[PDB]
Amino acid sequence: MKGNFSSFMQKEIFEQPESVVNTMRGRVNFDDYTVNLGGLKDHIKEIQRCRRLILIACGTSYHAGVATRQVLEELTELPVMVELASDFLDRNTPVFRDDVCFFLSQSGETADTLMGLRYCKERGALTVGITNTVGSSISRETDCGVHINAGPEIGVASTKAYTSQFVSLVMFALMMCDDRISMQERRKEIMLGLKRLPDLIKEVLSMDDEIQKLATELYHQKSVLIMGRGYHYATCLEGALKIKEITYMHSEGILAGELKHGPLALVDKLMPVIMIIMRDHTYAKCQNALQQVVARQGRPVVICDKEDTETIKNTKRTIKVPHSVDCLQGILSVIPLQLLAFHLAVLRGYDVDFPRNLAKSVTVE
Amino acid sequence: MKGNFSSFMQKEIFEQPESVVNTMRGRVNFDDYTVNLGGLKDHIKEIQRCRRLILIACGTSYHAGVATRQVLEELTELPVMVELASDFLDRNTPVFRDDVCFFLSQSGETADTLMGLRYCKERGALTVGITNTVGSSISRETDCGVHINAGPEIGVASTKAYTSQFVSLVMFALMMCDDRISMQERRKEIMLGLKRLPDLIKEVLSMDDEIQKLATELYHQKSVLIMGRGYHYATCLEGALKIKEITYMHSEGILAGELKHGPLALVDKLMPVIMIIMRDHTYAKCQNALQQVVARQGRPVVICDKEDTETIKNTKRTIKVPHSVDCLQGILSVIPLQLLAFHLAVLRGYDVDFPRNLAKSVTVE
Ligand SMILES: O=P(O)(O)OC[C@H]1O[C@H](O)[C@H](O)[C@@H](O)[C@@H]1O
Ligand SMILES: O=P(O)(O)OC[C@H]1O[C@H](O)[C@H](O)[C@@H](O)[C@@H]1O
């Protein structure tokens, strides 16, 4: 059952300390800093010989690709392209024999993702499935893959599977760079982060009541702009998607560096704005975005890290999440957005697990 | 002056038959199907030897890249990556010696685009400027370039420069494939399209009164979803941007193949929806998107081609544009969206040339 929770989605959000452990179970060894994804053991040397990584997906799975693009670029040193599967197909995207294509899919049955897989296979690319469903078409038809091991997810709006996909792609990245002397300190930083992550997720979930109060402030609103950049760009997209999915409010993710190029004309004292600002190398530029938003009379809610003394000092509405390594922080920063969507949906009387007009998996067309 | 027009933006929209001719002037010869961009004459063989095209830009210039990605892929057979300049920089995107990087910029001074240029130059990439401003930093600092020759554009919301950038990148694509026997019929198709385009733009502008009537139907609305896919994905993004820029309504471009993955939960009888449906190879899939929207009680306005008998027959609100070749159709289909933004802004009492919170060029940070 959902037993102890009124919805599957809330259960699944609160399961994230355990789902992240489950994803890393048998794969990461924190004593000797090894990571092994057995499903990729054979094919790994081959992947390192490939020239480009292409991540192909729909919906929240696509966001997990956007969330891990930078660390994949960093640690593989390969170009990484992230593609919405329907557009990838419409464009007859060039794929080559020495491309490695990843198919990210909770269900493993999404029609566009599966047809993208078949397209790449026809062109001789090495294909890799990252799914949550053993025995699924995408799991069966790829050359190799990783079962993210998040466990069954029933909520139509995906929560634990997003963060389990995120962790899976980070573990892949860690395997890819494991022969480089120069990257050993970076790998150890990230792995110590992964070790700490479950406890930090518990700490985020403890602010559920604060998020519920923010949802009471927002639930009459018709729009909200969610702004972030760099590692947190995916966080804003996925948070915007979540609020669309189950609340039906018109939430839009805005790349923070593009704010000044159009979206800022929507900012005034009446447009709700959520800004994500983390202490990574984009920090000063995000502070600049915040300053612009405030200068145009917006009253943003800011998601920042607990140790970010200056924005806590100088900003009235902050949702304070624990600090982690730059490339893992989005796992923490998305959770208040998952919870915000949840609580907004509840305030509005809407079904959180089975929203209108949506399906857990779109297997047709 | 703007003389005969009350705004620079309306003047600039109505100048598009002439700006497109100006862009192609001295470059396309319709008698012998040659295209020559002298600024690229020397460097062309070198570009053909490169391995990847990367288009880097902000705002509407970025949309022109999205609008031409597919035809560039098709005719160059090269991978093409399109990047928002601010994100490109934040990620420390891998660039290589045998990449060719294009910088699309009306002003040639946008800080993020210019810093992207400098980043690529440092990495030994061949750099190409596509700008509307002679003597600009991006024009001066690239290895070669094309002045799009649209003439001065004063409206902060870019209109003629979008369609002139679009045409410039198509002419580049035509140069790239000009030694291939197998592509000669395709090149001639596209060039006969470019020859016809100015007259077809006049025909679109003649429906200004119909668009003004649609703006009267929309101007109390707070949101609008603009949906398209394939070649028309850029058209929906740029139309959404235009409505944000000068009307301050919350318009969002939605990739039509992603509709079913979240945005469809926003559709009911009260959410305005504009769908773009063209008779290219995405047609049946767009009809499916339309059917879903109508099935969930939406009442969309559809932008379709005049000769699309079946959606004209079966859909009540259509904005009927002239038929062109698939890879040029977005030049026509964006124009009613430029005009819709214009007329909405006028109905709301807002300054169309100098909207709040925005600048013609963001040269700082
Ligand atoms: O992640 P996949 O099974 O390929 O599905 C892609 C998407 O399809 C459906 O729309 C779901 O409601 C989503 O939660 C999901 O992100
Ligand atoms: O096209 P560029 O000069 O690089 O400018 C990028 C953008 O900057 C400004 O925001 C303008 O208002 C836009 O119309 C434009 O698209």
Whichever domain contains A77, its CATH number is: 3.40.50.10490
Q: How far is CA B195 from CA B67, B167, B298, in A?
A: 19, 11, 38
If phi > 0 it is left, if psi is from -120 to 50 it is alpha, else beta; for residue A243 that is alpha
Pairing of strands A144-147, A126-131: parallel
Q: What is chain B's percent helix, strand, coil content, to nearest 5?
A: 50, 15, 35
CA of A196 to the centre of ligand 2 (A): 43
Q: How would you label A41-50 residue by residue, b for 16+ Cβ within 10 Å and e otherwise?
A: eebbeebeeb
A243 and A168, same structural domain?
A: no
Distance CA A302, CA A311 (A): 9
Q: Let me know whether A164 and A97 are in one domain.
A: yes
Rg (CA), chain A: 20
- Same structural domain, B40 and B175: yes
Statement to judge: residues A252 and A357 lie in one domain? no
Q: Could you tell me where the DSSP H helices lie in A25-132? A: 44-49, 59-76, 85-90, 111-122
Q: Do A220 and A126 share a structural domain?
A: no
Atom of ligand 1 nearest to the CA of A157: 14
Query: What is d(CA A240, CA B325) in angstroms, rounded to the nearest whole number?
Result: 35
d(CA B80, CA B52): 6
Residue nearest to atom 10 of ligand 2 (CA): A261
Q: Nearest by CB to B86, from A59, A257, A355: name it.
A: A257
Q: Are strands B28-29 and A273-277 parallel, antiparallel or unpaired?
A: unpaired
- Using the Cα atoms of residue A277, residue A280, residue A282 and residue A288 in order, give the sign of their dihedral: positive
User: Residue B61: CB within 6 Å of ligand 2?
Assistant: yes
- Judge if A346 and A356 occupy the same domain: no
- Compute CA distances B255 → A107, A225, A348, B252, B316, whole Å: 21, 18, 27, 10, 23
Residues A17 and A166 in one domain: yes
Question: Which residues of chain B make contact with A296, given a CB cutoff of 8 A?
Answer: 356-357
Nearest beta carbon to residue B358 from set A223, A262, A281: A262
Structure token digits, residue A102: 């990843």
Which structure tokens are listed for A47? 């992947």
Name the DSSP letter for residue B213.
Answer: H
Residue A226: DSSP 8-state = E
Please list, residue by residue across A151-168, b when 16 or more beta carbons sit within 10 angstroms of its beta carbon and e when fewer do: eebebbbbbbbbbbbbbb
B220, B212 Cβ separation under 8 angstroms: no
User: Do A313 and A236 fall into the same domain?
Assistant: yes
Residue pair B256/B277 in contact (Cβ under 8 Å)? The answer is no
What phi and psi values does residue A286 have, to the nearest 5 degrees? -65, -40
Cβ proximity of B122 and B14 under 8 Å? no
**Comparing C-alpha atoms, which of A216, A221, A256, A218 is closest to residue A236?**
A256
Number of helices followed by number of strands (H, E) in chain A: 15, 12
Q: Which of A145, A203, A169 is nearest to A80 (CA)?
A: A169
- For chain B, how long is the longest CA-to-CA vector? 56
> In Å, how far is B298's CA from the nearest CA of chain A?
12
Are A90 and B282 within 8 A, CB to CB? Answer: yes
Ligand 1 neighbours by CB, cut-off 6 Å: A 58-61, 105-107, 110, 113, 156-158, 358-362; B 261
Cα nearest neighbour of A223 on chain B: B250
DSSP of B3-64: TTSSSHHHHHHHTHHHHHHHHHTTTEETTTTEE--GGGTTTHHHHHH-SEEEEEE-HHHHHH
Question: Are B23 and B69 in a shared domain?
Answer: yes
The answer, yes or no, to whether any atom of ligand 2 lies below 6 A from the CB of B156, is yes
Technique employed here was X-ray
Per-residue b or e along B145-162, where b marks 16 or more CB atoms closer than 10 Å to that residue's CB: bbbbbbeebebbbbbbbb
Do B75 and B49 reside in the same domain of the chain?
yes
Nearest by CB to residue A229, choosing from B86, B261, B266, is B86
Ligand number, closest to the Cα atom of B130: 2
Q: Which residue of B has its CA nearest to A230?
A: B90
Which atom of ligand 1 is nearest to A62's Cα? Answer: 16
Q: How far is B118 from chain A (nearest CA, A)?
A: 18
Tokens of A7: 């919805």
Query: In this structure, is the dihedral angle defined by the CA atoms of residues B304, B305, B306 and B311, taken in order, positive or negative?
Result: negative
Distance CA A346, CA A215 (A): 9
CB contact under 8 A, B357 and A264: yes
Q: Which domain holds residue A40?
A: 1-202+351-365
HSE-up of residue B240 (Cα within 13 Å, Cβ side):
28
Q: What are B332's two structure tokens?
A: 């026509």
Pair A190, A68: CB distance under 8 Å: no
Task: Compute the nearest-CA separation of B112 from chain A (Å).
Answer: 9
**Among B57, B158, B226, residue whose Cα is nearest residue A258:** B57
DSSP assignment of A307-364 equals T-HHHHHH-SSEEEEPP--TTTHHHHHTHHHHHHHHHHHHHTT--SSS-TT--S----
Rounded Cα–Cα distance for residues A235 and A95 (Å): 28
Whole-number Å distance between alpha carbons of B324 and B279: 10
Residues A120 and A264 grouped into a single domain: no
Q: How many domains are there within chain A? A: 2
Ligand 2, atom nearest to B161 Cα? 1
Does residue B299 contact residue B317 with C-beta atoms inside 8 Å? yes
| Locus of tokens 């297997």 | A363
Q: Which of A317, A320, A295 is nearest to A305 (CA)?
A: A320
The tokens describing B238, both together, are 């740029």
As a whole number of angstroms, the distance between CA B82 and CA B85 comes to 9
Under 8 Å CB pairs connecting chains A and B tally to 153
Same domain membership, residue A195 and residue A210: no
Residues of B in contact with A92 (CB under 8 A): 70, 73-74
> Rounded CA gap, A30 and B167, in Å?
55
Shortest distance, CA B31 to any CA of chain A (angstroms) = 31
- The atom number, within ligand 2, closest to the CA of B158 reads 14
Asked if B44 and B175 touch (Cβ cutoff 8 Å), the reply is yes
B219 touches B348 (CB < 8 A) = yes
Q: In angstroms, how far is CA B153 from the centroid of its own chain? A: 16
Residue with the two structure tokens 């016809």: B196
CB A234 within 8 A of CB A183: no
What does residue A168 show for φ and ψ, rounded to 5 degrees? Answer: -60, -40
Cα–Cα distance for residue pair B157/B354, rounded to 1 Å = 8
CA distances from A341 to A164, A220, A223, A243, A249 (A): 19, 13, 13, 5, 10
CA B264 to chain centre: 25
Phi-psi region of A248 (alpha: psi -120 to 50; beta: other; left: phi over 0): left
Helix (H) / strand (E) containing B176: helix B160-176
A328, with CB counted inside 10 A (0-12, 13-18, 19+), is buried
Angle between helices A233-247 and A59-76 (to 10 degrees): 170
Residue A263 DSSP class: G
